[PDB]
Structures are given as structure tokens and as C-alpha cells.
Curated annotation (Swiss-Prot):
Gene Ontology biological process: actin filament-based movement; microtubule cytoskeleton organization
Binding of Ca(2+) 3, residues: 92, 94, 96, 103
UniProt GO molecular function: calcium ion binding; enzyme regulator activity; myosin VI head/neck binding
Species, as recorded: Drosophila melanogaster
Protein name according to UniProt: Calmodulin-related protein 97A
SMART domains: EFh
Limits of the EF-hand domain: 6-41, 42-77, 79-114, 115-147
Cellular component terms per the entry's GO annotation: cytoplasm; investment cone; myosin VI complex; nucleus
Described function: May be involved in calcium-mediated signal transduction.
């Protein structure tokens, strides 16, 4: 995910709003209702996809990480360069200023995106034009913009 401070507290607030059980979780059936409560607006099919999935993958309750996770993929609708730089620091395991195939999978797995060293390697080559096997704030911004 890559939500700012205000954004995080925004959906996080609307998240606790639908948690009377005190389980820090929100019913997947209330997901669509929560979206309406938020500036979001997922397509009918979309809601039916994530809800049905979480219905047999999370019993009947959803987690902050679950909701946020989606909100993240949804927020991607904005290719703002700002949110990219922030994601650059988070992704880049090191402070050198570059990302390597190793660091790529390491992060993708942290977020929740299951990927192999093969598929991710190609993704790097796509954003890597200088051909060096490393990513810079520029090559990163581009590949994540399409994410
Ligand atoms: Ca709950
Ligand atoms: Ca690094
Ligand atoms: Ca490069």
C-alpha cells in the first residue's frame, strides 16, 4: 500500500466506524457500504469479486490490512509523482538509492503480492532502459505508476 498520513487516518477512521464487535475487523458484507462512505467507488463486479473471495478466505470478517490492501490498488488511479517517491523509500530496502531484483521480491512479498524472481525480473527490464539491473527513482516511478 501507499496511503499518506491523512489518507490512512481517513479510511482507518471509517474503518473503526463499522467495528462494534471490537474485533478490529469489518464484515466483508459491509465493505461496499464502507466504499460509499469513502471517496472511493468500486465497480459492482469488483465488490462482488473481493467480497466473495474474502467470504471464503476470511470467514466473514475483514482486516484493516485487507481493506487497506484494496484501497491501495484502487488509489493507484492516481499516478502522482509524490506518492511514488514515498514508495521509493519504502521499496528500496537499502538507502543507497537503487532497487535490485532481490529487493523487489522482498517488498512485493511484504505488501502481499506473491511473485517469482522470474516475473519480477522482467518487470525490472521494462522500466530499466539504461540496462544495469538496478532501478532509480525514475524507473521506479514509471513501473509503479502502471501497478
Ligand atoms: Ca468487527
Ligand atoms: Ca537498495
Ligand atoms: Ca536502471
Amino acid at each position: 500500500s501507499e496511503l499518506t498520513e491523512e489518507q490512512i487516518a481517513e479510511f482507518k477512521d471509517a474503518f473503526v466506524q463499522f467495528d462494534k464487535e471490537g474485533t478490529g475487523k469489518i464484515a466483508t458484507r459491509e465493505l461496499g457500504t464502507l466504499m460509499r462512505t469513502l471517496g472511493q467507488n468500486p465497480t459492482e463486479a469488483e465488490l462482488q469479486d473481493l467480497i466473495a473471495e474474502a467470504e471464503n478466505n476470511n470467514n466473514g470478517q475483514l482486516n484493516f490490512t485487507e481493506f487497506c490492501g484494496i484501497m491501495a490498488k484502487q488509489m493507484r488511479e492516481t499516478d502522482t509523482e509524490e506518492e511514488m517517491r514515498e514508495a521509493f523509500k519504502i521499496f528500496d530496502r537499502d538507502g543507497d538509492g537503487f532497487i535490485s531484483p532481490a529487493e523487489l521480491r522482498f517488498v512485493m512479498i511484504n505488501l502481499g503480492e506473491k511473485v517469482t524472481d522470474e516475473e519480477i525480473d522482467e518487470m525490472i527490464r521494462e522500466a530499466d532502459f539504461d540496462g544495469d539491473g538496478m532501478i532509480n527513482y525514475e524507473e521506479f516511478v514509471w513501473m509503479i505508476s502502471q501497478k
